[PDB]
Amino acid sequence: TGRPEWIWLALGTALMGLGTLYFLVKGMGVSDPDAKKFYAITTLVPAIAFTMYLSMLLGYGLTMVPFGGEQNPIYWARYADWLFTTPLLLLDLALLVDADQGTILALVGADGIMIGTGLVGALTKVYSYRFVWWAISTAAMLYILYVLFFGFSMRPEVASTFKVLRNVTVVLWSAYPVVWLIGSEGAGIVPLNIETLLFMVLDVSAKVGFGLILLRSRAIFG
Amino acid sequence: TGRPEWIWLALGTALMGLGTLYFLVKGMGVSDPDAKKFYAITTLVPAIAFTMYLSMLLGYGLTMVPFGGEQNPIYWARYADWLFTTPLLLLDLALLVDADQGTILALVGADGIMIGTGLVGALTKVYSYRFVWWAISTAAMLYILYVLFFGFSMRPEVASTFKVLRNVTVVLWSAYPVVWLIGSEGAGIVPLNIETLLFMVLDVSAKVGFGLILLRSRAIFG
Amino acid sequence: TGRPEWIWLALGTALMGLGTLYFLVKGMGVSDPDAKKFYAITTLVPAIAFTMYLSMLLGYGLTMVPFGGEQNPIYWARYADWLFTTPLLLLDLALLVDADQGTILALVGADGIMIGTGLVGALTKVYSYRFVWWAISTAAMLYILYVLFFGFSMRPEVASTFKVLRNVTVVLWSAYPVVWLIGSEGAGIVPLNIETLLFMVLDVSAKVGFGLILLRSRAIFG
Numbered sequence: 001t002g003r004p005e006w007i008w009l010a011l012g013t014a015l016m017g018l019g020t021l022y023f024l025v026k027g028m029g030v031s032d033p034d035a036k037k038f039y040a041i042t043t044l045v046p047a048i049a050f051t052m053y054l055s056m057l058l059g060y061g062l063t064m065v066p067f068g069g070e071q072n073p074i075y076w077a078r079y080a081d082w083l084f085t086t087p088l089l090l091l092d093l094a095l096l097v098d099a100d101q102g103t104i105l106a107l108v109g110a111d112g113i114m115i116g117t118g119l120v121g122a123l124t125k126v127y128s129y130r131f132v133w134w135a136i137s138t139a140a141m142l143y144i145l146y147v148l149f150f151g152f153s154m155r156p157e158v159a160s161t162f163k164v165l166r167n168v169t170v171v172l173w174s175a176y177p178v179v180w181l182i183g184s185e186g187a188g189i190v191p192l193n194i195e196t197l198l199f200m201v202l203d204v205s206a207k208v209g210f211g212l213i214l215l216r217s218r219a220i221f222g
Numbered sequence: 223t224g225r226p227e228w229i230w231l232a233l234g235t236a237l238m239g240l241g242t243l244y245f246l247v248k249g250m251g252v253s254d255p256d257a258k259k260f261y262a263i264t265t266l267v268p269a270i271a272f273t274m275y276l277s278m279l280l281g282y283g284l285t286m287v288p289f290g291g292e293q294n295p296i297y298w299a300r301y302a303d304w305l306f307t308t309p310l311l312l313l314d315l316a317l318l319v320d321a322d323q324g325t326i327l328a329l330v331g332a333d334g335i336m337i338g339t340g341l342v343g344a345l346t347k348v349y350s351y352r353f354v355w356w357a358i359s360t361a362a363m364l365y366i367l368y369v370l371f372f373g374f375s376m377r378p379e380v381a382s383t384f385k386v387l388r389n390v391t392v393v394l395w396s397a398y399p400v401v402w403l404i405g406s407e408g409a410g411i412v413p414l415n416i417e418t419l420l421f422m423v424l425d426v427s428a429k430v431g432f433g434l435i436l437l438r439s440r441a442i443f444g
Numbered sequence: 445t446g447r448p449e450w451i452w453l454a455l456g457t458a459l460m461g462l463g464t465l466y467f468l469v470k471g472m473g474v475s476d477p478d479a480k481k482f483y484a485i486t487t488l489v490p491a492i493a494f495t496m497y498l499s500m501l502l503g504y505g506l507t508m509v510p511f512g513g514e515q516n517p518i519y520w521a522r523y524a525d526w527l528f529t530t531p532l533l534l535l536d537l538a539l540l541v542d543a544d545q546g547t548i549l550a551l552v553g554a555d556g557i558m559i560g561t562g563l564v565g566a567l568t569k570v571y572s573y574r575f576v577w578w579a580i581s582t583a584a585m586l587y588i589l590y591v592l593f594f595g596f597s598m599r600p601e602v603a604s605t606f607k608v609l610r611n612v613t614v615v616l617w618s619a620y621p622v623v624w625l626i627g628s629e630g631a632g633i634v635p636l637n638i639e640t641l642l643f644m645v646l647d648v649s650a651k652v653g654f655g656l657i658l659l660r661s662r663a664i665f666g
């Protein structure tokens with residue numbers, strides 16, 4: 001459309017759609033209950049992202065936020081996506097290593113706090129306070145990354161695949177607060193069309209790339 | 223009130239209230255943990271619907287959506303209801319057959335996608351796009367119905383009761399996308415007062431009728 | 445600020461922040477899975493409350509509701525807090541006594557209904573109807589309190605600690621509907637600044653006070 005970022009929302013929509021259908025077909029036939037869990041979780045993630053990319057593409061998931069005395073285009077639908085998809089991604093990791101339930105609840109809840117405070121930050125009209133929310137969200141993120149690294153006799157296959165996905169997760173997720181900070185939600189140093197591209201690349205990598213690694217491994221089978 | 227559909231919202235409120243109190247009294251005394259689960263799930267469903275029917279009745283759960291250059295009355299509270307009640311209904315089925323957790327997560331998540339995209343569709347102001355959301359929601363519904371039919375040594379009692387509730391579920395749930403399509407959210411072929419009646423009959427049947435079948439069966443006891 | 449209630453939102457923010465960091469440090473080193481659960485649940489509760497107290501403090505979690513022909517300041521962020529923190533508090537109790545899953549689902553769902561109907565009540569513009577929602581919410585609360593008292597061979601340590609926390613819970617939670625009723629959401633007999641103080645004292649007691657009791661007990665360890 002007239003939104004220069006449309007192309008990246010259209011490509012992200014397509015790529016998440018295609019990944020969803022690929023993982024859907026792929027899990028057909030799986031009967032191993034353990035594998036079934038990883039397929040469900042991992043197919044749902046880009047399915048949800050598909051819908052929220054489409055909602056941005058069609059303009060539904062966009063709102064205007066006044067701050068710095070301008071009308072700032074804020075794509076709120078990203079936060080509806082991440083609210084569900086990031087705990088699911090963490091559940092994939094958590095099930096892989098057979099985490100304690102207390103650790104899973106710590107992780108999902110810290111994640112909720114991460115996304116929810118990112119959303120408040122995204123919609124806050126007092127510019128300096130936006131970054132207070134950014135910082136609290138970032139602290140939740142660092143708690144999560146901490147736990148993925150220092151809170152965890154897995155069969156070697158589990159350990160191997162977990163170590164790869166953990167490294168994928170730390171590197172990609174750590175980029176999100178930077179993109180937000182430099183983009184239109186934060187300091188406005190990078191234009192929205194380039195921010196939207198950055199988040200498209202991260203999201204497809206963190207969802208479809210991550211799931212391709214995971215669903216290809218024997219680590220998911222009993 | 224001045225809303226011709228008020229009578230059907232009032233009757234639905236009453237019928238969901240009465241079913242809630244009936245199942246509440248009925249489960250008094252149940253000590254079998256397995257039965258306790260089916261009572262909790264099944265009592266909660268019309269309790270939630272009661273509150274959302276009342277919110278429509280009092281006017282809180284109604285908003286105006288501009289599309290086709292008119293101010294279209296959209297009852298959004300139905301989606302808050304269904305967001306919680308339809309996965310609970312699926313959990314009842316899922317527990318009955320002792321489904322794998324991966325299958326339960328596939329089902330709840332597809333359901334979330336179904337209702338959430340129905341909600342986006344209901345609130346979308348570009349008329350043609352409303353039906354894009356309808357179609358995606360319908361595809362999620364067909365996934366769910368698929369799984370209820372082709373994804374599942376139950377004691378005979380389980381199998382019998384499941385087969386009945388599964389048939390109830392496919393027939394009633396499949397009617398919802400049609401009512402939406404022909405009613406005020408979609409093509410506007412049927413007036414809101416008749417749509418509201420249709421959804422009242424479906425909802426009471428899918429909640430109170432379904433639970434009467436289920437809670438009467440010995441299938442719910444260990 | 446210019447909001448006389450700011451001091452109590454600032455103190456509540458600080459006290460919930462400090463309790464969160466205290467329980468965080470405290471649970472460092474716990475390896476007992478059972479204890480890990482109670483720490484996660486119990487650290488998350490004031491963490492969430494911290495964010496929602498800060499959102500009120502900064503003005504984000506405040507909206508104006510027209511009712512009685514005035515513009516009534518309503519802090520909606522309390523309901524986002526409680527929506528998550530009150531079922532977590534109930535989960536702490538429920539895990540302590542090893543409740544049946546059916547009882548946990550009854551409790552979380554009644555709780556959802558309690559907070560959600562409180563929220564509708566808080567945002568309803570027809571003044572008399574506000575108290576219809578109050579009453580339904582209160583009925584959900586009384587169901588919960590009922591179950592905490594009459595629905596439950598625990599090791600003596602469990603029983604002791606549960607009896608204390610149950611008594612803490614009944615007394616503090618029962619005060620919330622009264623504060624709402626007499627305060628700015630309800631009859632307007634007590635000013636918002638005094639209401640905000642009352643809820644600050646209850647919240648800190650029900651979260652940080654409750655968790656101090658719980659996390660100090662050996663009841664949380666296998």
Ligand SMILES: CC(C)CCCCCCCCCCCC[C@H](C)CCCCCCCC(C)C
Pocket residue numbers: 015018019022201204205208209210212
């Ligand atoms: C059969 C497998 C390999 C997957 C094909 C399904 C299609 C959709 C997603 C697949 C590609 C993603 C690889 C993961 C990592 C990346 C960093 C993706 C970032 C996107 C950038 C654009 C590059 C081209 C693509 C169209 C694949």
Ligand SMILES: CC(C)CCCCCCCCCCCC[C@H](C)CCCCCCCC(C)C
Pocket residue numbers: 237240241244423426427430431432434
């Ligand atoms: C004791 C049992 C039978 C239930 C009585 C509790 C009352 C409320 C619901 C009970 C009736 C519902 C039967 C399920 C199926 C139906 C298709 C219901 C659709 C509603 C249509 C109106 C018919 C009359 C009613 C008032 C029951």
Ligand SMILES: CC(C)CCCCCCCCCCCC[C@H](C)CCCCCCCC(C)C
Pocket residue numbers: 459462463466645648649652653654656
């Ligand atoms: C190490 C322990 C004791 C806790 C210290 C962490 C700090 C924050 C919360 C601790 C205090 C709360 C006690 C629970 C009960 C109360 C009724 C709290 C209500 C608050 C009223 C203000 C009183 C002073 C306070 C600043 C503690």
Ligand SMILES: *C/C=C(C)/C=C/C=C(C)/C=C/C1=C(C)CCCC1(C)C
Pocket residue numbers: 082085086089114115117118119121133134137138139141173174176177180203206207
């Ligand atoms: C599917 C997409 C994923 C994996 C997205 C991850 C998003 C985050 C890790 C976001 C983090 C943020 C912060 C740490 C700071 C505030 C802004 C956020 C929400 C972008």
Ligand SMILES: *C/C=C(C)/C=C/C=C(C)/C=C/C1=C(C)CCCC1(C)C
Pocket residue numbers: 304307308311336337339340341343355356359360361363395396398399402425428429
């Ligand atoms: C308690 C009520 C129940 C069982 C409601 C079920 C609702 C659905 C199956 C709704 C389905 C829809 C679609 C498939 C298409 C878009 C519109 C919906 C949300 C009405």
Ligand SMILES: *C/C=C(C)/C=C/C=C(C)/C=C/C1=C(C)CCCC1(C)C
Pocket residue numbers: 526529530533558559561562563565577578581582583585617618620621624647650651
């Ligand atoms: C962390 C805070 C807690 C424990 C808050 C508890 C809140 C309640 C028990 C609220 C109850 C309410 C009703 C029973 C009636 C309507 C108003 C409410 C939501 C304040």
